[PDB]
Amino acid sequence: ARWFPKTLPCDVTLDVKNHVIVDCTDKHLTEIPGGIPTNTTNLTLTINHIPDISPASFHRLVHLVEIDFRCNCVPIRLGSKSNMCPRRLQIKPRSFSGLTYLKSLYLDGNQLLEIPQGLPPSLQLLSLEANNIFSIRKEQLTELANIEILYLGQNCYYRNPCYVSYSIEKDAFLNLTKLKVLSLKDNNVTTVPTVLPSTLTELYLYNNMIAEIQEDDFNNLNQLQILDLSGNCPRCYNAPFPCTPCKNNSPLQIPVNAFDALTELKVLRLHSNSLQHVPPRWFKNINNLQELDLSQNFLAKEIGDAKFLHFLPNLIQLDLSFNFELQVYRASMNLSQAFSSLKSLKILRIRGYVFKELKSFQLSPLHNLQNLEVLDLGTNFIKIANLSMFKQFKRLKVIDLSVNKISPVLEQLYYFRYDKYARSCSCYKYGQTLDLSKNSIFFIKSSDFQHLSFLKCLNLSGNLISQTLNGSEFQPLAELRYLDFSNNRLDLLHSTAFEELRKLEVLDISSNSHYFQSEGITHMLNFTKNLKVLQKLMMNDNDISSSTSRTMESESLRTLEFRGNHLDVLWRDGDNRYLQLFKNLLKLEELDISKNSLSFLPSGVFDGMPPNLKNLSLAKNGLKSFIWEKLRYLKNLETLDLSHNQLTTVPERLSNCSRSLKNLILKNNQIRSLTKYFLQDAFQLRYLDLSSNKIQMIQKTSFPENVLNNLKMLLLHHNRFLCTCDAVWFVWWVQHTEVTIPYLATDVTCVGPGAHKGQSVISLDLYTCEL
Amino acid sequence: ARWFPKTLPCDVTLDVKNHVIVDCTDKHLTEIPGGIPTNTTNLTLTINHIPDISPASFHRLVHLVEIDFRCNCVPIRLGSKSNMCPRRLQIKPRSFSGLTYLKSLYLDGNQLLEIPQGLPPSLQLLSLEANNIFSIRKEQLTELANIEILYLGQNCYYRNPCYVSYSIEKDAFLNLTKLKVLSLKDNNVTTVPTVLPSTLTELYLYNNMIAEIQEDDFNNLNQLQILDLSGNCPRCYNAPFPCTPCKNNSPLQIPVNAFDALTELKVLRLHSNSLQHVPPRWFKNINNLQELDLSQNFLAKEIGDAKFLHFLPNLIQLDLSFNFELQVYRASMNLSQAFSSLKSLKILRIRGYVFKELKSFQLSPLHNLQNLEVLDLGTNFIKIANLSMFKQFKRLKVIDLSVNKISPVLEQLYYFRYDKYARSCSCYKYGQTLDLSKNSIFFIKSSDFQHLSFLKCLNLSGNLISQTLNGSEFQPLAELRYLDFSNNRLDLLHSTAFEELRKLEVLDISSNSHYFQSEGITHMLNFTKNLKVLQKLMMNDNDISSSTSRTMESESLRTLEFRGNHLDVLWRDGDNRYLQLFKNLLKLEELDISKNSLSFLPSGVFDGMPPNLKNLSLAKNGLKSFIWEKLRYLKNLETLDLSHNQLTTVPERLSNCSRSLKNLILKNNQIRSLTKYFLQDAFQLRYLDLSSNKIQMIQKTSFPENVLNNLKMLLLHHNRFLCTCDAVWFVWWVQHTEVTIPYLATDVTCVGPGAHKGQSVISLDLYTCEL
Numbered sequence A, B: 001a002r003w004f005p006k007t008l009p010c011d012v013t014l015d016v017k018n019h020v021i022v023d024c025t026d027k028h029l030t031e032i033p034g035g036i037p038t039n040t041t042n043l044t045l046t047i048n049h050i051p052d053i054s055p056a057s058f059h060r061l062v063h064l065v066e067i068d069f070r071c072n073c074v075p076i077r078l079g080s081k082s083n084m085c086p087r088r089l090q091i092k093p094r095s096f097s098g099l100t101y102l103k104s105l106y107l108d109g110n111q112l113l114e115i116p117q118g119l120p121p122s123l124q125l126l127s128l129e130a131n132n133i134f135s136i137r138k139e140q141l142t143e144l145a146n147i148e149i150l151y152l153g154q155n156c157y158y159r160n161p162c163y164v165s166y167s168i169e170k171d172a173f174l175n176l177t178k179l180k181v182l183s184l185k186d187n188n189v190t191t192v193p194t195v196l197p198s199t200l201t202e203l204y205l206y207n208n209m210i211a212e213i214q215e216d217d218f219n220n221l222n223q224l225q226i227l228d229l230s231g232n233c234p235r236c237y238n239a240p241f242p243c244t245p246c247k248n249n250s251p252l253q254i255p256v257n258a259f260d261a262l263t264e265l266k267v268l269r270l271h272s273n274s275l276q277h278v279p280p281r282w283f284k285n286i287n288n289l290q291e292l293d294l295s296q297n298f299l300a301k302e303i304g305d306a307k308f309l310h311f312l313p314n315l316i317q318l319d320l321s322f323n324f325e326l327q328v329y330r331a332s333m334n335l336s337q338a339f340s341s342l343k344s345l346k347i348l349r350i351r352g353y354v355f356k357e358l359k360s361f362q363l364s365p366l367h368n369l370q371n372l373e374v375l376d377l378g379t380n381f382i383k384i385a386n387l388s389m390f391k392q393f394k395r396l397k398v399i400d401l402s403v404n405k406i407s408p409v410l411e412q413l414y415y416f417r418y419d420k421y422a423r424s425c426s427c428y429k430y431g432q433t434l435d436l437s438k439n440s441i442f443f444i445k446s447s448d449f450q451h452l453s454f455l456k457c458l459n460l461s462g463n464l465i466s467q468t469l470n471g472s473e474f475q476p477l478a479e480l481r482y483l484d485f486s487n488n489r490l491d492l493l494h495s496t497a498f499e500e501l502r503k504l505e506v507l508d509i510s511s512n513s514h515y516f517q518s519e520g521i522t523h524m525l526n527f528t529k530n531l532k533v534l535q536k537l538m539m540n541d542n543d544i545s546s547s548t549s550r551t552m553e554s555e556s557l558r559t560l561e562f563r564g565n566h567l568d569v570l571w572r573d574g575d576n577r578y579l580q581l582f583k584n585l586l587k588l589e590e591l592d593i594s595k596n597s598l599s600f601l602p603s604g605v606f607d608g609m610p611p612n613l614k615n616l617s618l619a620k621n622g623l624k625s626f627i628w629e630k631l632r633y634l635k636n637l638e639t640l641d642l643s644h645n646q647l648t649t650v651p652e653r654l655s656n657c658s659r660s661l662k663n664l665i666l667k668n669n670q671i672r673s674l675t676k677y678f679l680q681d682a683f684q685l686r687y688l689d690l691s692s693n694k695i696q697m698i699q700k701t702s703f704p705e706n707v708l709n710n711l712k713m714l715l716l717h718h719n720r721f722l723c724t725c726d727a728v729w730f731v732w733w734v735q736h737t738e739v740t741i742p743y744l745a746t747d748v749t750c751v752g753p754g755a756h757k758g759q760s761v762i763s764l765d766l767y768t769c770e771l
């Protein structure tokens, strides 16, 4: 199709509007490549090893609005140790001054010593994170008259130290009269720099050495919407980063009138400031405040009083997590009545308060919060909770009691990680959720869930339930749609397990391997028959190698995840009792039987598949052979994943195996060559992955053009391609085709002959084959 | 050193006595190789694809006493499906008759139709398992006059069916006057063949279709020691193989006088015979009986009566496992007083009796069994057990309550597998063991172990213990040497955990990842300080990524398994706080920190290692780089396992890194070449593994002969060796060296230059490099 092969090692995209995008992210480049389109508006060269920039770099590219040149020399401790950057990035005079339309420049992570000068006046965003610029002078900032967004953080901290205090000249930023966003985080800053331009909307001063706020420090910032002063005087108990507290167990000292000017303030973040009190006076003139983070302080006592809450009626989120007093295990949670002032509250989080017994009345300040959607009391070591108290919280979307010690989405490192916003180079949607995951529930019965019939999802993942569920345990949960019972010890003695959950759409019993791992125990896998609206069943990593029932049954079920089991043993050659195990799942469209140690499939496995099977995975089975003809049985098969196996051959003619098949994944196999007519007339095919095999040669007969050209994608990388004159057609095709083939720049490569070893096939001149 | 290179693709061993052993096991052979030593006494060709035997096969090898020719054509269902055997093995006339000294012939698993004829009269052992010989005639057996051991089983069963009954001519075996061992198992046999020669010591008739024993069937077998009639009229409940019971739930019918002749019988096996009664009269004339297997019958009631036990005073092992009545959960275990008759009993196993409550008095028949060493009551769904009852079983070596449901070594498939003796082509030694693994113990306290101070090992692996152990939980266990606490949920709030176990030598707290997987929880890894005689600590797969203590401490500890954790995060670059985590384990000699996601090691890791470290593993870390010089810090290092990483290079001179190092494992890395003087003067070295890398070339400078020749082993297989004239020395060396290098037959191989692709380097003629 194409007249001129795209030889540029960067993805090029159009958009009309009106952007020409050139993305060279992570292309192992040591120079800016030649032939970048002159119309280029956005050029990305992130993660490469380009050691300098000069006026030659961008000469012809006068229409550039954005250059993203991040991480071409990242600080030693932040980057790869196998390929360390030898020397900081060199920027030569007048490299940017030509770029009359340049609006964004990202130079993060280049070990720069200074704010690059000679930048053009059209620049709105400038990002210099993770460099070694730790002294800002007014003179260096004059070029930035029209600047709106300025990221200067991570220039002096434990991952990238500068060994002195940050320095900011008096009034350095003042004459930047258009500045809206300033970030000075992770910098060893000692005082709020002043005076700052009043135009500011967002100010980020977190993770620094600021011991005191002066009452002056935010006087003029009357358009400020986000202030973050977190991690100045951090609370260091169990901190997963090196943590130095302020002397004398002191807090970040904030004058009572410090926030008076900030009438527009929407978000205030005071996490890890070692605060013992929260003075009401702080919020006297802020009534627009919507988000407040008071996590990681010493506010356990203040939670019982909290007079400041009366001043916060528009507040949408409040976080008081990890305010526990060291070495104290409270009997209960004392929430102040003041919590009842929070008319607009949607999200309340009080993780890590740390108390033994939760009781209904203790949440009564929350009863009339009409908008409350989330109550998060995770990680509290709660031992006792009458779950029925939550009958008064029907309106809530999520009740999170995750990670507690009861017996009858945020980052996994969120509250403790250093900078949760650091730049690198789920059943809630079913309705009301009670999350009881990672608790100590060993026994359940009906009354445990009394008054909880409104519940739509229940998370019991990671408890100790080790019990012969007979259909009586969950009887009140008449509206339950999703049950996560993963990481328990389900005993399937009774096929009546779970049948009381008459509205159940999704059941996860993955990682309940305990009772499947011992010989001679009963397992009623036919339990699915009773669940009339069950759509999705996950029974992964259960080590299932024996079953009392010969057949699983459902009129409703569509997806079955059966990965990480032992069908190899169930379908032991010579034993045909279980070949029809899935056949009576009549509406089953998706089946995952990857990770089942299936070296081979006995005859009968395919015949025994249910008739509407569409998406089949046999990945990661160590499969050494595959009778491809047997795909004829699966009359609606559209996706076949045979990734990560040991197949050495493809079918002689794929269209004689399956007429329906559209997506064939054969990556990470041992295929050495294709059959002479492999894809001939396979008109249904649309996605083919042959990456990470050991193919040398592809001839036209195997890959007819009329099939190839309707492929949405065709993955060929990491093979063993021989670039002799026999390869003439393949090479030509690859160079001139519109079909998307990833990694041409990077890992579609000749291994031989001699001359062309290691050379990418996109770049290959084979003119000597026509001389 | 050697004058003539060993080119035969088989391991050759001498022994004086006086055997020349040639082992060609699994060498992908399609012919018997040439040049087998004429003095060969034992030739093994197991698992190859040799399609026939003829007089040429063994012509010169007249001194052969044993031919093992197993599995060169295994039945379709038993063998590989990627390389199925096309056609049964052909044996030609007179292939064996020359072999005048032949004493053993194994022809198992070759799809033979008939007992190969023309065998020599010196033959003592003949094995024809897993063939298709399912009709034995007196005439075919006349060659075997002097035969002593005859294995004919697995010729007709579900893994290798023959579709008819087995047939044995009347008196077929009678004139084999020297026969001692006859095995007719897994054969669809319908009656005990008669008359059998009285010389028999062992008779194997298990897994067949024998409905009745005639009172005659064992009349003359007065030297018989082992009889096994198991799995005739099997009990089929939860059988993991296809299982057809005798009609009317009938048992194997055994006349009361059937065993009268068997005065020498030592072992009787009646497993899976659907027995409802055990008539005393059976044992009237057998007082030598030492082993009795009555597992998989319907003997629940009989266990309460068991009059037959009075006739068995010399019995050493008894097995009554899996005799439960279907659908019954007994309240208790009724053991007959008759159990007190068993003066010689060492081992009693009553798995799968199935009862709720175990109580002291119920074991009183066992109190005066002076020799009892093992009581196995595993897999009983016991809910309640005062563990103090075992104060009356101090003399026992093992009390096994594994796989039960309690709250406040044999095969994993042993009792249920088809043929536990099918041929394929641990803290007990510390003293008294109480195995409580895989139970439902969620809470422990002191009194749980009252009167149990004699215990030396306790297995609590795989319970639900989820508790802040403070040093009070195990207080009675004053002599305990080994605690397996693996697969629980240890909460290390307190550093006093386990301190009451003052004699503890080994602690396994592996797979207690639950509390290490959540953020902001305390973990006192310094808990080891209190354990004064602790030798070995296993804390594998705990996902440990944070720690309250900066240092682990012990004066005693020698081995620490810390595999499968997140030292990568603990030793996050820039964070120095945990670089000395193991330093104060002063006597630590072995450390495993494989599987820790260590892409690189920060500086300080090696400095912070304790001073007597000898065996260090960094396997399976994805390590991309390694400063080898830093090995100088580990002054007593002897074993370094860097297997399964991404190292691309070896040290310039290994002796400049470590003077102590003896075993260096670099297998499964990405090493493309060795340094010019790699092993120069490394006189301490003894074992070097460079297998599975991508090395092309090794020159003499890298591998000096004076280092090489003290190596006990040197692994080079699965590399990318180029066999040009530059390789002349390497090839010569490999052909003529006495140093052990495994897999020279199989996987030490040229990939090029072209001619020699796929040719083994042992066989390589490079004379053209000297022309």
Ligand SMILES: *[C@@H]1O[C@H](CO)[C@@H](O[C@@H]2O[C@H](CO)[C@@H](O)[C@H](O)[C@H]2NC(C)=O)[C@H](O)[C@H]1NC(C)=O
Pocket (backbone or CB within 6 Å): A156, A157, A158, A160, A161, A162, A163, A164, A165, A166, A188
């Ligand atoms: C933050 O600034 C302080 C100075 O305020 C740095 O601390 C100095 O570091 C050197 C070498 O580490 C010491 O010898 C000085 O005495 C330190 N001075 C003080 C006052 O502590 C600190 O390292 C800087 N932080 C970072 C991460 O670069």
Ligand SMILES: CCCCOc1nc(N)c2[nH]c(=O)n(Cc3ccccc3)c2n1
Pocket (backbone or CB within 6 Å): A468, A491, A492, A493, A515, A520, A521, A522, A523, B324, B326, B327, B328, B329, B352, B354, B379, B381
């Ligand atoms: C040794 C197997 C006994 C019969 O099978 C079997 N399988 C299980 N999963 C349970 N759970 C379980 O509690 N039992 C005990 C039982 C036995 C009979 C009647 C009721 C309860 C189990 N028995």
Ligand SMILES: CCCCOc1nc(N)c2[nH]c(=O)n(Cc3ccccc3)c2n1
Pocket (backbone or CB within 6 Å): A324, A327, A328, A329, A352, A354, A379, A380, A381, B468, B491, B492, B493, B515, B520, B521, B522, B523
């Ligand atoms: C979430 C912050 C609580 C402090 O750390 C922490 N870590 C643990 N592993 C436990 N186990 C545990 O039971 N607690 C609660 C506790 C707290 C103080 C005193 C006694 C008991 C824990 N607290």
Ligand SMILES: *[C@@H]1O[C@H](CO)[C@@H](O)[C@H](O)[C@H]1NC(C)=O
Pocket (backbone or CB within 6 Å): A019, A021, A041, A042, A065, A066, A103, A104
């Ligand atoms: C192109 O640059 C403009 C200005 O920086 C930006 O708003 C737009 O999102 C960019 N598009 C990219 C990187 O694809």
Ligand SMILES: *[C@@H]1O[C@H](CO)[C@@H](O)[C@H](O)[C@H]1NC(C)=O
Pocket (backbone or CB within 6 Å): A402, A426, A427, A428, A437, A438, A459, A460, A461, A462, A484
């Ligand atoms: C249940 O909680 C677990 C463990 O905290 C989490 O992995 C999982 O996402 C939750 N399941 C659902 C369906 O939300």
Ligand SMILES: *[C@@H]1O[C@H](CO)[C@@H](O)[C@H](O)[C@H]1NC(C)=O
Pocket (backbone or CB within 6 Å): A470, A471, A472
């Ligand atoms: C289920 O078990 C509960 C108690 O464990 C019992 O009340 C109920 O009757 C049982 N149901 C059936 C159908 O056996």
Ligand SMILES: *[C@@H]1O[C@H](CO)[C@@H](O)[C@H](O)[C@H]1NC(C)=O
Pocket (backbone or CB within 6 Å): A495, A496, A524, A526, A527, A529, A530, A548, A549, A550, A551
């Ligand atoms: C399930 O398993 C078997 C039949 O295969 C039978 O014992 C049991 O009653 C069946 N129950 C249900 C609900 O299908």
Ligand SMILES: *[C@@H]1O[C@H](CO)[C@@H](O)[C@H](O)[C@H]1NC(C)=O
Pocket (backbone or CB within 6 Å): B019, B021, B041, B042, B065, B066, B103, B104
């Ligand atoms: C060699 O064969 C003899 C006779 O069958 C046997 O007893 C001996 O175990 C064999 N030895 C080895 C090492 O294979």
Ligand SMILES: *[C@@H]1O[C@H](CO)[C@@H](O)[C@H](O)[C@H]1NC(C)=O
Pocket (backbone or CB within 6 Å): B156, B157, B158, B160, B161, B162, B163, B164, B165, B188
């Ligand atoms: C055992 O014999 C019966 C008839 O006697 C036959 O139908 C059956 O197939 C045989 N079994 C096998 C496994 O060959």
Ligand SMILES: *[C@@H]1O[C@H](CO)[C@@H](O)[C@H](O)[C@H]1NC(C)=O
Pocket (backbone or CB within 6 Å): B386, B388, B389, B391, B450, B451
């Ligand atoms: C268990 O039995 C012992 C006798 O050895 C007795 O001292 C103890 O009180 C019993 N404990 C319980 C909890 O039943």
Ligand SMILES: *[C@@H]1O[C@H](CO)[C@@H](O)[C@H](O)[C@H]1NC(C)=O
Pocket (backbone or CB within 6 Å): B402, B426, B427, B428, B437, B438, B459, B461, B462, B484
């Ligand atoms: C404890 O029991 C488990 C089986 O439940 C086993 O794998 C482990 O090796 C046993 N521990 C010891 C120390 O023997």
Ligand SMILES: *[C@@H]1O[C@H](CO)[C@@H](O)[C@H](O)[C@H]1NC(C)=O
Pocket (backbone or CB within 6 Å): B495, B496, B524, B526, B527, B529, B530, B548, B549, B550
């Ligand atoms: C362990 O570490 C803590 C400090 O992190 C200390 O309080 C405690 O006493 C130490 N315990 C032992 C047994 O060393």
Ligand SMILES: *[C@@H]1O[C@H](CO)[C@@H](O)[C@H](O)[C@H]1NC(C)=O
Pocket (backbone or CB within 6 Å): B590, B592, B615, B639
């Ligand atoms: C080193 O450790 C491994 C197990 O971790 C062991 O198999 C090996 O024998 C040890 N080496 C020596 C020389 O003791």
Ligand SMILES: *[C@@H]1O[C@H](CO)[C@@H](O)[C@H](O)[C@H]1NC(C)=O
Pocket (backbone or CB within 6 Å): B632, B655, B656, B657, B658
């Ligand atoms: C390494 O070699 C150099 C030069 O031979 C020597 O000076 C140095 O001390 C050596 N280091 C060790 C650890 O042997």
